[PDB]
PDB file of all heavy atoms in Angstrom:
ATOM      1  N   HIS A 238      32.359  10.553  13.652  1.00  2.00           N
ATOM      2  CA  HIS A 238      31.056   9.976  13.623  1.00  2.00           C
ATOM      3  C   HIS A 238      30.161  10.525  12.590  1.00  2.00           C
ATOM      4  O   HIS A 238      30.361  11.744  12.202  1.00  2.00           O
ATOM      5  CB  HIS A 238      30.441  10.093  15.020  1.00  2.00           C
ATOM      6  CG  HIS A 238      29.114   9.492  15.341  1.00  2.00           C
ATOM      7  ND1 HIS A 238      27.945  10.166  14.956  1.00  2.00           N
ATOM      8  CD2 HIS A 238      28.814   8.178  15.537  1.00  2.00           C
ATOM      9  CE1 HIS A 238      26.863   9.373  15.197  1.00  2.00           C
ATOM     10  NE2 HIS A 238      27.379   8.281  15.623  1.00  2.00           N
ATOM     11  N   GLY A 308      20.554  15.007  17.145  1.00  2.00           N
ATOM     12  CA  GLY A 308      20.478  13.797  16.505  1.00  2.00           C
ATOM     13  C   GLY A 308      21.276  12.802  17.261  1.00  2.00           C
ATOM     14  O   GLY A 308      22.017  13.103  18.212  1.00  2.00           O
ATOM     15  N   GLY A 309      21.115  11.455  17.024  1.00  2.00           N
ATOM     16  CA  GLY A 309      22.050  10.426  17.501  1.00  2.00           C
ATOM     17  C   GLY A 309      21.524   9.601  18.590  1.00  2.00           C
ATOM     18  O   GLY A 309      21.898   8.583  19.104  1.00  2.00           O
ATOM     19  N   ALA A 310      20.205  10.102  19.188  1.00  2.00           N
ATOM     20  CA  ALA A 310      19.600   9.542  20.238  1.00  2.00           C
ATOM     21  C   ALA A 310      18.302  10.133  20.434  1.00  2.00           C
ATOM     22  O   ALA A 310      18.038  11.251  20.060  1.00  2.00           O
ATOM     23  CB  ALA A 310      20.477   9.425  21.639  1.00  2.00           C
ATOM     24  N   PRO A 311      17.497   9.387  21.312  1.00  2.00           N
ATOM     25  CA  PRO A 311      16.219   9.874  21.621  1.00  2.00           C
ATOM     26  C   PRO A 311      16.306  11.239  22.372  1.00  2.00           C
ATOM     27  O   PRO A 311      17.051  11.421  23.344  1.00  2.00           O
ATOM     28  CB  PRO A 311      15.581   8.835  22.539  1.00  2.00           C
ATOM     29  CG  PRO A 311      16.424   7.657  22.279  1.00  2.00           C
ATOM     30  CD  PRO A 311      17.791   8.194  21.850  1.00  2.00           C
ATOM     31  N   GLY A 332      17.247  15.419  13.720  1.00  2.00           N
ATOM     32  CA  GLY A 332      17.548  14.420  12.706  1.00  2.00           C
ATOM     33  C   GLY A 332      17.547  13.039  13.191  1.00  2.00           C
ATOM     34  O   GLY A 332      18.097  12.806  14.368  1.00  2.00           O
ATOM     35  N   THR A 336      24.519   5.209  11.125  1.00  2.06           N
ATOM     36  CA  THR A 336      25.854   5.287  10.539  1.00  2.06           C
ATOM     37  C   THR A 336      25.648   4.548   9.196  1.00  2.06           C
ATOM     38  O   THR A 336      26.155   4.930   8.110  1.00  2.06           O
ATOM     39  CB  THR A 336      26.942   4.492  11.276  1.00  2.06           C
ATOM     40  OG1 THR A 336      27.099   5.218  12.575  1.00  2.06           O
ATOM     41  CG2 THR A 336      28.245   4.364  10.544  1.00  2.06           C
ATOM     42  N   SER A 340      23.898   9.651   6.747  1.00  2.00           N
ATOM     43  CA  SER A 340      23.413  10.860   7.544  1.00  2.00           C
ATOM     44  C   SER A 340      21.990  10.646   8.001  1.00  2.00           C
ATOM     45  O   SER A 340      21.416   9.526   7.947  1.00  2.00           O
ATOM     46  CB  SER A 340      23.694  12.029   6.753  1.00  2.00           C
ATOM     47  OG  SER A 340      23.428  13.225   7.410  1.00  2.00           O
ATOM     48  N   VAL A 355      10.989  13.563  14.989  1.00  2.00           N
ATOM     49  CA  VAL A 355      12.278  13.422  14.421  1.00  2.00           C
ATOM     50  C   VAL A 355      12.181  14.059  12.985  1.00  2.00           C
ATOM     51  O   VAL A 355      13.161  14.029  12.173  1.00  2.00           O
ATOM     52  CB  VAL A 355      12.669  11.966  14.713  1.00  2.00           C
ATOM     53  CG1 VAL A 355      12.826  11.239  13.408  1.00  2.00           C
ATOM     54  CG2 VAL A 355      13.729  11.979  15.801  1.00  2.00           C
ATOM     55  N   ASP A 415      14.586   0.380  15.390  1.00  2.00           N
ATOM     56  CA  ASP A 415      13.934   1.293  16.205  1.00  2.00           C
ATOM     57  C   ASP A 415      12.339   1.230  15.968  1.00  2.00           C
ATOM     58  O   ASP A 415      11.863   0.879  14.799  1.00  2.00           O
ATOM     59  CB  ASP A 415      14.349   2.725  15.705  1.00  2.00           C
ATOM     60  CG  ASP A 415      15.814   2.987  15.805  1.00  2.00           C
ATOM     61  OD1 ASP A 415      16.269   2.606  16.995  1.00  2.00           O
ATOM     62  OD2 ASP A 415      16.507   3.338  14.980  1.00  2.00           O
ATOM     63  N   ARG A 430      12.925   1.141  21.222  1.00  2.00           N
ATOM     64  CA  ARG A 430      13.853   0.397  20.361  1.00  2.00           C
ATOM     65  C   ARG A 430      13.727  -1.200  20.672  1.00  2.00           C
ATOM     66  O   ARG A 430      13.346  -1.487  21.868  1.00  2.00           O
ATOM     67  CB  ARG A 430      15.290   0.701  20.531  1.00  2.00           C
ATOM     68  CG  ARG A 430      16.198   0.007  19.742  1.00  2.00           C
ATOM     69  CD  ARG A 430      17.618   0.794  19.600  1.00  2.00           C
ATOM     70  NE  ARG A 430      18.594  -0.148  18.869  1.00  2.00           N
ATOM     71  CZ  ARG A 430      18.779  -0.361  17.574  1.00  2.00           C
ATOM     72  NH1 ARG A 430      17.854   0.548  16.730  1.00  2.00           N
ATOM     73  NH2 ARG A 430      19.636  -1.064  17.018  1.00  2.00           N
TER      74      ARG A 430
HETATM   75  N1  M24 B 501      16.892  11.476  16.376  1.00  2.00           N
HETATM   76  C1  M24 B 501      16.861  10.342  17.013  1.00  2.00           C
HETATM   77  N2  M24 B 501      15.997  10.071  17.852  1.00  2.00           N
HETATM   78  C2  M24 B 501      16.004   8.814  18.564  1.00  2.00           C
HETATM   79  N3  M24 B 501      16.981   7.980  18.327  1.00  2.00           N
HETATM   80  C3  M24 B 501      17.998   8.266  17.446  1.00  2.00           C
HETATM   81  C4  M24 B 501      18.050   9.408  16.792  1.00  2.00           C
HETATM   82  N4  M24 B 501      19.045   9.361  16.018  1.00  2.00           N
HETATM   83  C5  M24 B 501      19.755   8.305  16.243  1.00  2.00           C
HETATM   84  N5  M24 B 501      19.101   7.533  17.015  1.00  2.00           N
HETATM   85  C6  M24 B 501      19.383   6.247  17.551  1.00  2.00           C
HETATM   86  O1  M24 B 501      20.828   5.991  17.184  1.00  2.00           O
HETATM   87  C7  M24 B 501      20.904   4.701  16.344  1.00  2.00           C
HETATM   88  C8  M24 B 501      21.980   5.050  15.227  1.00  2.00           C
HETATM   89  O2  M24 B 501      23.245   5.380  15.839  1.00  2.00           O
HETATM   90  P1  M24 B 501      24.528   5.551  15.168  1.00  2.00           P
HETATM   91  O3  M24 B 501      25.633   6.009  16.054  1.00  2.00           O
HETATM   92  O4  M24 B 501      24.795   4.458  14.057  1.00  2.00           O
HETATM   93  O5  M24 B 501      24.270   6.773  14.068  1.00  2.00           O
HETATM   94  C9  M24 B 501      23.750   8.125  14.559  1.00  2.00           C
HETATM   95  O6  M24 B 501      23.390   8.289  15.595  1.00  2.00           O
HETATM   96  C10 M24 B 501      23.679   9.106  13.484  1.00  2.00           C
HETATM   97  C11 M24 B 501      24.355   8.842  12.159  1.00  2.00           C
HETATM   98  C12 M24 B 501      24.284   9.747  11.113  1.00  2.00           C
HETATM   99  C13 M24 B 501      23.718  10.919  11.296  1.00  2.00           C
HETATM  100  C14 M24 B 501      23.104  11.231  12.367  1.00  2.00           C
HETATM  101  C15 M24 B 501      22.401  12.536  12.599  1.00  2.00           C
HETATM  102  N6  M24 B 501      21.671  12.840  13.585  1.00  2.00           N
HETATM  103  O7  M24 B 501      21.175  14.064  13.355  1.00  2.00           O
HETATM  104  C16 M24 B 501      21.515  14.483  12.198  1.00  2.00           C
HETATM  105  C17 M24 B 501      21.203  15.816  11.675  1.00  2.00           C
HETATM  106  C18 M24 B 501      20.510  16.766  12.280  1.00  2.00           C
HETATM  107  C19 M24 B 501      20.073  17.964  11.812  1.00  2.00           C
HETATM  108  C20 M24 B 501      20.381  18.255  10.505  1.00  2.00           C
HETATM  109  C21 M24 B 501      21.309  17.232   9.775  1.00  2.00           C
HETATM  110  C22 M24 B 501      21.534  16.050  10.370  1.00  2.00           C
HETATM  111  F1  M24 B 501      22.303  15.124   9.760  1.00  2.00           F
HETATM  112  N7  M24 B 501      22.384  13.598  11.753  1.00  2.00           N
HETATM  113  C23 M24 B 501      23.014  10.296  13.530  1.00  2.00           C
HETATM  114  C24 M24 B 501      19.591   4.592  15.707  1.00  2.00           C
HETATM  115  O8  M24 B 501      19.265   3.231  15.411  1.00  2.00           O
HETATM  116  C25 M24 B 501      18.616   5.092  16.801  1.00  2.00           C
HETATM  117  O9  M24 B 501      18.470   4.064  17.828  1.00  2.00           O
END
Side-chain angles (χ1 to χ4, degrees):
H238 180 271
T336 300
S340 188
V355 113
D415 301 311
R430 191 161 166 87

